[PDB]
Design an enzyme around this catalytic site. Structure first.
Site, PDB file in Angstrom:
ATOM      1  N   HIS A 143       0.853  -1.230   0.000  1.00 14.59           N
ATOM      2  CA  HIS A 143       0.000   0.000   0.000  1.00 14.59           C
ATOM      3  C   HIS A 143       0.880   1.270   0.000  1.00 14.59           C
ATOM      4  O   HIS A 143       0.477   2.283  -0.576  1.00 14.59           O
ATOM      5  CB  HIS A 143      -0.974   0.041   1.187  1.00 14.59           C
ATOM      6  CG  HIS A 143      -1.748  -1.228   1.369  1.00 14.59           C
ATOM      7  ND1 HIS A 143      -2.819  -1.627   0.513  1.00 14.59           N
ATOM      8  CD2 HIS A 143      -1.656  -2.194   2.309  1.00 14.59           C
ATOM      9  CE1 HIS A 143      -3.304  -2.781   0.924  1.00 14.59           C
ATOM     10  NE2 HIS A 143      -2.604  -3.152   2.016  1.00 14.59           N
ATOM     11  N   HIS A 182       5.225   7.093   6.770  1.00 20.67           N
ATOM     12  CA  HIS A 182       4.991   6.717   5.361  1.00 20.67           C
ATOM     13  C   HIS A 182       4.502   7.927   4.591  1.00 20.67           C
ATOM     14  O   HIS A 182       4.217   8.967   5.225  1.00 20.67           O
ATOM     15  CB  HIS A 182       3.979   5.582   5.314  1.00 20.67           C
ATOM     16  CG  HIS A 182       2.692   5.996   5.938  1.00 20.67           C
ATOM     17  ND1 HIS A 182       2.450   5.900   7.274  1.00 20.67           N
ATOM     18  CD2 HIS A 182       1.592   6.539   5.395  1.00 20.67           C
ATOM     19  CE1 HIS A 182       1.267   6.423   7.550  1.00 20.67           C
ATOM     20  NE2 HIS A 182       0.706   6.776   6.403  1.00 20.67           N
ATOM     21  N   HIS A 191       1.824   9.253   1.147  1.00 20.82           N
ATOM     22  CA  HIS A 191       0.790   9.045   0.105  1.00 20.82           C
ATOM     23  C   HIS A 191       1.165   9.897  -1.083  1.00 20.82           C
ATOM     24  O   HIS A 191       1.546  11.067  -0.853  1.00 20.82           O
ATOM     25  CB  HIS A 191      -0.581   9.398   0.660  1.00 20.82           C
ATOM     26  CG  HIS A 191      -0.939   8.624   1.876  1.00 20.82           C
ATOM     27  ND1 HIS A 191      -1.599   7.369   1.813  1.00 20.82           N
ATOM     28  CD2 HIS A 191      -0.685   8.868   3.171  1.00 20.82           C
ATOM     29  CE1 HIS A 191      -1.796   6.937   3.065  1.00 20.82           C
ATOM     30  NE2 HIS A 191      -1.222   7.880   3.934  1.00 20.82           N
ATOM     31  N   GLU A 242      -3.687  13.570   0.896  1.00 21.68           N
ATOM     32  CA  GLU A 242      -4.947  13.043   1.464  1.00 21.68           C
ATOM     33  C   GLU A 242      -5.757  14.230   1.960  1.00 21.68           C
ATOM     34  O   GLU A 242      -6.895  14.417   1.544  1.00 21.68           O
ATOM     35  CB  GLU A 242      -4.601  12.038   2.568  1.00 21.68           C
ATOM     36  CG  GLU A 242      -4.052  10.775   1.955  1.00 21.68           C
ATOM     37  CD  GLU A 242      -4.244   9.525   2.751  1.00 21.68           C
ATOM     38  OE1 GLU A 242      -4.008   9.570   4.011  1.00 21.68           O
ATOM     39  OE2 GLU A 242      -4.675   8.518   2.083  1.00 21.68           O
ATOM     40  N   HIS A 300       3.071  11.165   6.621  1.00 20.48           N
ATOM     41  CA  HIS A 300       2.434  10.923   7.917  1.00 20.48           C
ATOM     42  C   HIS A 300       3.422  10.287   8.864  1.00 20.48           C
ATOM     43  O   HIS A 300       3.886   9.162   8.574  1.00 20.48           O
ATOM     44  CB  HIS A 300       1.240   9.952   7.675  1.00 20.48           C
ATOM     45  CG  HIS A 300       0.108  10.561   6.922  1.00 20.48           C
ATOM     46  ND1 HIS A 300      -0.880   9.798   6.293  1.00 20.48           N
ATOM     47  CD2 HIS A 300      -0.199  11.847   6.649  1.00 20.48           C
ATOM     48  CE1 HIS A 300      -1.745  10.617   5.729  1.00 20.48           C
ATOM     49  NE2 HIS A 300      -1.337  11.873   5.900  1.00 20.48           N
ATOM     50  N   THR A 337      -6.374   6.636   7.727  1.00 19.43           N
ATOM     51  CA  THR A 337      -6.909   6.881   6.351  1.00 19.43           C
ATOM     52  C   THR A 337      -6.843   5.616   5.515  1.00 19.43           C
ATOM     53  O   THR A 337      -7.203   5.694   4.321  1.00 19.43           O
ATOM     54  CB  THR A 337      -6.194   8.029   5.627  1.00 19.43           C
ATOM     55  OG1 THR A 337      -4.888   7.497   5.429  1.00 19.43           O
ATOM     56  CG2 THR A 337      -6.297   9.335   6.412  1.00 19.43           C
ATOM     57  N   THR A 338      -6.399   4.510   6.091  1.00 22.30           N
ATOM     58  CA  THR A 338      -6.516   3.160   5.456  1.00 22.30           C
ATOM     59  C   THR A 338      -7.267   2.228   6.384  1.00 22.30           C
ATOM     60  O   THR A 338      -7.271   2.425   7.603  1.00 22.30           O
ATOM     61  CB  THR A 338      -5.127   2.564   5.173  1.00 22.30           C
ATOM     62  OG1 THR A 338      -4.466   2.375   6.424  1.00 22.30           O
ATOM     63  CG2 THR A 338      -4.234   3.431   4.320  1.00 22.30           C
TER      64      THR A 338
HETATM   65  O1  LIG Z   1      -0.173   3.411   8.379  1.00 20.50           O
HETATM   66  C1  LIG Z   1      -1.364   3.666   8.209  1.00 20.50           C
HETATM   67  C2  LIG Z   1      -1.826   4.563   7.065  1.00 20.50           C
HETATM   68  C3  LIG Z   1      -2.499   5.811   7.543  1.00 20.50           C
HETATM   69  N1  LIG Z   1      -3.448   5.890   8.509  1.00 20.50           N
HETATM   70  N2  LIG Z   1      -3.665   7.213   8.714  1.00 20.50           N
HETATM   71  N3  LIG Z   1      -2.910   7.928   7.934  1.00 20.50           N
HETATM   72  N4  LIG Z   1      -2.182   7.053   7.195  1.00 20.50           N
HETATM   73  N5  LIG Z   1      -2.321   3.185   8.999  1.00 20.50           N
HETATM   74  C4  LIG Z   1      -2.080   2.228  10.086  1.00 20.50           C
HETATM   75  C5  LIG Z   1      -2.564   0.781   9.713  1.00 20.50           C
HETATM   76  C6  LIG Z   1      -2.844  -0.159  10.868  1.00 20.50           C
HETATM   77  C7  LIG Z   1      -3.702   0.226  11.898  1.00 20.50           C
HETATM   78  C8  LIG Z   1      -3.970  -0.628  12.959  1.00 20.50           C
HETATM   79  C9  LIG Z   1      -3.387  -1.872  13.011  1.00 20.50           C
HETATM   80  C10 LIG Z   1      -2.532  -2.271  11.995  1.00 20.50           C
HETATM   81  C11 LIG Z   1      -2.263  -1.419  10.930  1.00 20.50           C
HETATM   82 ZN   LIG Z   2      -0.957   7.813   5.973  1.00 19.85          ZN
END
Ligand SMILES: O=C(Cc1nnn[nH]1)NCCc1ccccc1
Ligand SMILES: [Zn+2]
EC number: 4.2.1.1
Length: 258
Positions: A62, A92, A94, A104, A117, A196-197
């Site tokens: 992703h 990371h 986007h 985003e 982020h 946001t994912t």
């Molecule tokens: O890295 C991101 C992207 C993202 N979220 N917000 N902004 N970017 N989200 C965390 C993904 C995650 C959440 C909880 C458990 C396992 C994995």
């Molecule tokens: Zn992100």
């Protein structure tokens, strides 16, 4: 049929496996600069990355995650709208297929070429997994990228991407200093929102910096050469890995600045 950014599995589909996608505090949002109110009670943001320990860079299919040692309180975010101490775990980006899209969050509907982020968790919950189940579990520092001059502090990230082209590839990434990714000013917008994912959990205090960083065309072109796919599968370029703006609903965006 896992979630992604394609026609068949993109943000418009996510609510079928993650009904919270239509929830009351989803991210990202449009920041309307004429509606965001100055809040004089907001303290200055404290970004303490001097002792940050990076370990590894991972293509997760992703994005790419630069991961830090969060086992002690080294790299932390404090102050601004936050109560207590938030530990840096990963950053990371986007980004888009072209410079006119990729962020985003938006500013008066303007899309930036990309968005950084820096993800932090609230240490009073003991671990990241516990923190994402709380409304104040996470603090995400959002930084816009625009295309212009190269960012020196990004080039070490750009030069390792050749070695993590495909999903599930990682590389040793020690001694990277994320202070190299900040703008001059820590002036910010803040609002309560979500990841946001998927799983799109409503656990984030969003801190979005007003000042973008400049990266070169050559720097963002190397982000766009990554692959969503695993090794020896059909090539899908890792581009447009951004969720669009979501309804603000019953939320106020506060500005740290007049
Ligand atoms: O890295 C991101 C992207 C993202 N979220 N917000 N902004 N970017 N989200 C965390 C993904 C995650 C959440 C909880 C458990 C396992 C994995
Ligand atoms: Zn992100």
């Amino acid at each position: 049929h896992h979630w992604g950014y394609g026609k068949h599995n993109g943000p418009e589909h996510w609510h079928k496996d993650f009904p919270i996608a239509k929830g009351e505090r989803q991210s990202p949002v449009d920041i309307d600069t004429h509606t965001a109110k100055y809040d004089p009670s907001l303290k200055p943001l404290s970004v303490s990355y001097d002792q940050a320990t990076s370990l590894r860079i991972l293509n997760n299919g992703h994005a790419f995650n630069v991961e830090f040692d969060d086992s002690q309180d080294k790299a932390v975010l404090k102050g601004g709208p936050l109560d207590g101490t938030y530990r840096l775990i990963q950053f990371h980006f986007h980004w888009g297929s072209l410079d006119g899209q990729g962020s985003e969050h938006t500013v008066d509907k303007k899309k930036y070429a990309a968005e950084l982020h820096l993800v932090h968790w609230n240490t009073k919950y003991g671990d990241f997994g516990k923190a994402v189940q709380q409304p104040d579990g996470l603090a995400v520092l959002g930084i816009f990228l625009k295309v212009g001059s190269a960012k020196p502090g990004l080039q070490k990230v750009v030069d390792v991407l050749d070695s993590i082209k495909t999903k599930g590839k990682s590389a040793d990434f020690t001694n990277f200093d994320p202070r190299g990714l900040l703008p001059e000013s820590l002036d910010y917008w803040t609002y309560p929102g979500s990841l946001t994912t998927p799983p799109l959990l409503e656990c984030v205090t969003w801190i979005v910096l007003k000042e973008p960083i400049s990266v070169s065309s050559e720097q963002v072109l190397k982000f766009r050469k990554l692959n969503f796919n695993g090794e020896g599968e059909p090539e899908e370029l890792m581009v447009d890995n951004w969720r669009p703006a979501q309804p603000l609903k019953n939320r106020q965006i506060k500005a740290s600045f007049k």
